Amino acid sequence: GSMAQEQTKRGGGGGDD
Amino acid sequence: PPSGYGVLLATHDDDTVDVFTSGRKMRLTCSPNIDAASLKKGQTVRLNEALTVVEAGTFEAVGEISTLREILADGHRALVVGHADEERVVWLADPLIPRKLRPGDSLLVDTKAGYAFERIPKAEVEDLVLEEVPDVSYADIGGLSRQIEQIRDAVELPFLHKELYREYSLRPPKGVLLYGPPGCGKTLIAKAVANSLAKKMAEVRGDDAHEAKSYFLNIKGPELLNKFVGETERHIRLIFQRAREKASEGTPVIVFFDEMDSIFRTRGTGVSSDVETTVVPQLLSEIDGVEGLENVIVIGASNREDMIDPAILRPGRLDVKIKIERPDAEAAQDIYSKYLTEFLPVHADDLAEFDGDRSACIKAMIEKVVDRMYA
Amino acid sequence: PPSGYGVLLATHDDDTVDVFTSGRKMRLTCSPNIDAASLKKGQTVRLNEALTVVEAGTFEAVGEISTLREILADGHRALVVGHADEERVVWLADPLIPRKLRPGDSLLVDTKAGYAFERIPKAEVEDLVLEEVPDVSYADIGGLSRQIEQIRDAVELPFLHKELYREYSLRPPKGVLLYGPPGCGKTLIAKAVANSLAKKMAEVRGDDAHEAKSYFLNIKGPELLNKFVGETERHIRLIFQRAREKASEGTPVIVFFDEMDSIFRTRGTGVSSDVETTVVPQLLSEIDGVEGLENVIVIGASNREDMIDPAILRPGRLDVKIKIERPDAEAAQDIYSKYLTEFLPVHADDLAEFDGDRSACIKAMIEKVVDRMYA
Amino acid sequence: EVPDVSYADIGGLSRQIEQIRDAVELPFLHKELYREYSLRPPKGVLLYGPPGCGKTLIAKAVANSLAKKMAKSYFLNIKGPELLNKFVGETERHIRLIFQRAREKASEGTPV
Amino acid sequence: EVPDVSYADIGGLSRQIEQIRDAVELPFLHKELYREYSLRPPKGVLLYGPPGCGKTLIAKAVANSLAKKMAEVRGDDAHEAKSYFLNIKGPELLNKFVGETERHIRLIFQRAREKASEGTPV
Numbered sequence A: 001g002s003m004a005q006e007q008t009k010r011g012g013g014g015g016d017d
Numbered sequence B, C: 001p002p003s004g005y006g007v008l009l010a011t012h013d014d015d016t017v018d019v020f021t022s023g024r025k026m027r028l029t030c031s032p033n034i035d036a037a038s039l040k041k042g043q044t045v046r047l048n049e050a051l052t053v054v055e056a057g058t059f060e061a062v063g064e065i066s067t068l069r070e071i072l073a074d075g076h077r078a079l080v081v082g083h084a085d086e087e088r089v090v091w092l093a094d095p096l097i098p099r100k101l102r103p104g105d106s107l108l109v110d111t112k113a114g115y116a117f118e119r120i121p122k123a124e125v126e127d128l129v130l131e132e133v134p135d136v137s138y139a140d141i142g143g144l145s146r147q148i149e150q151i152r153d154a155v156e157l158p159f160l161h162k163e164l165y166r167e168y169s170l171r172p173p174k175g176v177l178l179y180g181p182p183g184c185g186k187t188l189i190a191k192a193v194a195n196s197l198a199k200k201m202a203e204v205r206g207d208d209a210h211e212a213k214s215y216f217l218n219i220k221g222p223e224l225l226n227k228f229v230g231e232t233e234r235h236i237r238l239i240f241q242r243a244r245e246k247a248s249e250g251t252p253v254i255v256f257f258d259e260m261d262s263i264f265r266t267r268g269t270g271v272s273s274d275v276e277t278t279v280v281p282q283l284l285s286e287i288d289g290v291e292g293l294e295n296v297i298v299i300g301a302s303n304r305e306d307m308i309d310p311a312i313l314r315p316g317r318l319d320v321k322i323k324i325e326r327p328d329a330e331a332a333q334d335i336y337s338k339y340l341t342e343f344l345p346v347h348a349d350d351l352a353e354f355d356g357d358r359s360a361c362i363k364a365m366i367e368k369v370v371d372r373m374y375a
Numbered sequence D: 001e002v003p004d005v006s007y008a009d010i011g012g013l014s015r016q017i018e019q020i021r022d023a024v025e026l027p028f029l030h031k032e033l034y035r036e037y038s039l040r041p042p043k044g045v046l047l048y049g050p051p052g053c054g055k056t057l058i059a060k061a062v063a064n065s066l067a068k069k070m071a072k073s074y075f076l077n078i079k080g081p082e083l084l085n086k087f088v089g090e091t092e093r094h095i096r097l098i099f100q101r102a103r104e105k106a107s108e109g110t111p112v
Numbered sequence E: 001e002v003p004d005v006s007y008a009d010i011g012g013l014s015r016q017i018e019q020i021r022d023a024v025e026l027p028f029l030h031k032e033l034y035r036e037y038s039l040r041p042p043k044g045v046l047l048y049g050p051p052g053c054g055k056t057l058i059a060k061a062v063a064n065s066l067a068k069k070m071a072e073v074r075g076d077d078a079h080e081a082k083s084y085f086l087n088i089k090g091p092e093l094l095n096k097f098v099g100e101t102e103r104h105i106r107l108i109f110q111r112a113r114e115k116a117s118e119g120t121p122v
């Protein structure tokens, strides 16, 4: 049960004005 | 007289200046009552209906804060990011050309005119590092006179006597390692050092309140552990950058790594976890790296000295090693004297044997209890 | 006296010029004073209420920055992607049409005008680490003579005699490794070669400090490790690209990796995280691949030689494996001489026996102390 | 969360009630007399023994009695296995948040 | 940029270079004979071995040979006579966003299918 770090993946977001 | 406002951009030898006004750039002359040479880049200046500068003001505006990324080579412009990951290059204002500007510092910017007017320092603030000033002082610790003198010579003495060390060309110690058995007192000495530093920065220098809070950067071991890859590294770099920027000539900044044994440990030990092959080298490189600290003392307290990695224990990182020992009979007597004060209510029948002399009575009780435990 | 501004777009044989002004595309005649022949695309010009070009000026320095996508066939246009993935075809101004514009570059662009002006890297962070070059040189390092000779042969010698290397058809070493027990002086050599390189760069081209420092990069360890997938690899790609621009076959770029074990592993020793499994192949491809760095030297330092991946410790990648060993008696004498300088004050009692001769007294003191410790 | 178990519900462990009272209940009743006498009030109690004997009941009864005695007191009940995650550091950050809330509540001066 | 390494600069491997040279050229050297036997050209070539044994060397030689061949066949040396070799680093296609890397994969293979012809290898 070795503990592990993580690497996240961003989700692009849409913004207008 | 209704008068306008605009943002100065640059000055010329023609005594005319470029100003961002009404969303567009204008070359305008200056009134004879205002000096054009006295003006500075990124200045809020007054205008009028004939489009002539009449007054100059402070560099105050309401603007979005951008995380500073890097200053350009020419030294006048810098790249910043935005909330929507918008990166733009902005000229520096006069106050921002003051403390040295560093990446990761928020800057108030007007993206239409593209000037970073000032830097907001409260946005980048760390309250986890700050520690409440302990009541404990040097006089409150007994039985460790040698260790107190050693830590005094390590920390307080070099800044009190600077010219004397410069005559001998001696640099202040760049690390202290307090270590020893459990309870014998390691956090108490850290509290005393923090209190002494707080007093020295409070009344000797007189800067202001909360200035003492700023120094003695205190972090516990497990606090640095995070959930991501290379996130603890960012915290280490940030805390060391803060220590570097806060420390001045003769100004000591102390970072206390309480519980040095558990944190870092020894590289290559521990099948379950592998945080070691990431955290220990950041600390190994921040201290005694290519670019070294100037007036920063790193104090580490450990109950398991041998557990700590040797690369950070060798001289040059943790030079002054102070060992706390278990109290002896005289040390136990001193510790009792530090707690069995004469302000405690003493029973009358207890005082009967010595005719009510509380000082001698308490000294005798301390002797009796020390003898009883050490028999 | 109040005059406007605009951006030049194109020139015609009618002695007229297209100018973007006040958010609209207009055509103007030039003043008789200004010559339309000398104008270049993208230049900023000054206008008036009569809408006449009166003076040309330098290109814009601030605005939005966008990543370059490709260069079109005509050569005057290029596709650029904005912060929110908007793509626009924009003209290339005179400064871009120096180093060849290549995709993956962040060009400063005015979207409404549609012109690109310049580009700036972010890897400066590493160049920002060595803000102050260390003052130590080889004269201040003792106990290592063969190692200094090898490190000079690896870096200084090929550039001092390029014609001899060309005649013998020998290229400068691609990489150098420094390994040894902790505290033996690896960072000293690493920070002294940087000083030597800065001195060389200042004396050869220009006395400017920033350009001289711009040839040594300090990785400092796990600084490349990042939160998001595929970001640290792109950081390495940018670092090596920035390295490949600055090389001119007469100027070395030294990328120093400190504590090699931090980011380098066997790809199987990783327990908690295996980011190194992705990181290592990227850097191996960068060093030696289809396209190889012609004149970039990578200097690596480590304390555990075995933990490093076998692929890196291969000839043609890390050619010379300099090993620093623990000092002997003569090396100890040299190190002591480097510190026990003659200018240090010495007691009159010690001066009594050697008739005040500071140098001989200090020397004999050095042999006495090394003999005491080496017993 | 407001505990409702009282000392009356507990049966056969009155002596344990009298020891546990002398460490948490009595100190906050007349803390002024203690700071006059300079005593340091206790900090932590470990209820240990065979399971299913009402270890949680004793703590809930103590908290309820302290709340009734006060004339505002705040109590936090966090079970063990909740503070467990496979990712590195999360279990420590949960403890940090719990104790941060504890200091937030204790800042007023009410018992926590 | 096209490397200058050729087959004459590789030594000690006269069998492996023969295999890769066949797999690259012979389906295109003799297309009529291949269609005579209905032999489909191979679509997967792997080069494996201990570090520093010449794998990237053979890759560079293959790229140089392809560039020279396409320079001989047609023109547009600026990008043509080289666009047919696509050099991809290992982690280079990895991307931050969830689906962008998959789009890169599909788009790379789509272009590789478009640019390819029966006489021009990709």
Ligand SMILES: Nc1ncnc2c1ncn2[C@@H]1O[C@H](COP(=O)(O)OP(=O)(O)OP(=O)(O)O)[C@@H](O)[C@H]1O
Pocket: B140, B141, B142, B143, B144, B181, B182, B183, B184, B185, B186, B187, B188, B189, B303, B335, B338
């Ligand atoms: N002069 C003294 N020497 C030793 N302990 C003292 C002294 N004065 C007070 N103490 C008491 O020692 C106790 C432990 O002090 P401290 O926490 O500094 O020790 P420690 O060895 O760092 O502990 P730990 O092993 O838990 O890290 C406290 O209760 C403190 O009040």
Ligand SMILES: Nc1ncnc2c1ncn2[C@@H]1O[C@H](COP(=O)(O)OP(=O)(O)OP(=O)(O)O)[C@@H](O)[C@H]1O
Pocket: B288, B311, B316, C140, C141, C142, C143, C144, C180, C181, C182, C183, C184, C185, C186, C187, C188, C189, C302, C303, C335, C338
């Ligand atoms: N000739 C010398 N040989 C070895 N050390 C020296 C010499 N001269 C000075 N030193 C001192 O040795 C100290 C350690 O230097 P350095 O940081 O290079 O060791 P290191 O081998 O890099 O340590 P680590 O392996 O832990 O990174 C320096 O602070 C320097 O003052």
Ligand SMILES: Nc1ncnc2c1ncn2[C@@H]1O[C@H](COP(=O)(O)OP(=O)(O)OP(=O)(O)O)[C@@H](O)[C@H]1O
Pocket: D009, D010, D011, D012, D050, D051, D052, D053, D054, D055, D056, D057, D058
């Ligand atoms: N005086 C009492 N002694 C023991 N159990 C009681 C008493 N009064 C009620 N109980 C019942 O015992 C049950 C278990 O209570 P509790 O959870 O406190 O036991 P526990 O010792 O905490 O168990 P565990 O050791 O598994 O945590 C409760 O549902 C309660 O109804």
Ligand SMILES: Nc1ncnc2c1ncn2[C@@H]1O[C@H](COP(=O)(O)OP(=O)(O)OP(=O)(O)O)[C@@H](O)[C@H]1O
Pocket: C288, C311, C314, C316, E009, E010, E011, E012, E013, E050, E051, E052, E053, E054, E055, E056, E057, E058
């Ligand atoms: N016949 C040959 N066999 C092996 N190596 C050679 C030969 N001829 C030249 N070399 C040299 O070997 C070096 C390494 O070649 P190459 O990069 O192909 O090895 P590699 O297997 O790709 O290494 P890695 O496995 O680390 O990627 C080249 O720089 C080349 O100069």
Ligand SMILES: [Mg+2]
Pocket: B185, B186, B187, B188, B301
């Ligand atoms: Mg302690």
Ligand SMILES: [Mg+2]
Pocket: B288, B289, C186, C187
């Ligand atoms: Mg070092």
Ligand SMILES: [Mg+2]
Pocket: D054, D055, D056, D057
């Ligand atoms: Mg229970």
Ligand SMILES: [Mg+2]
Pocket: C288, C289, E055, E056, E057
């Ligand atoms: Mg290879």
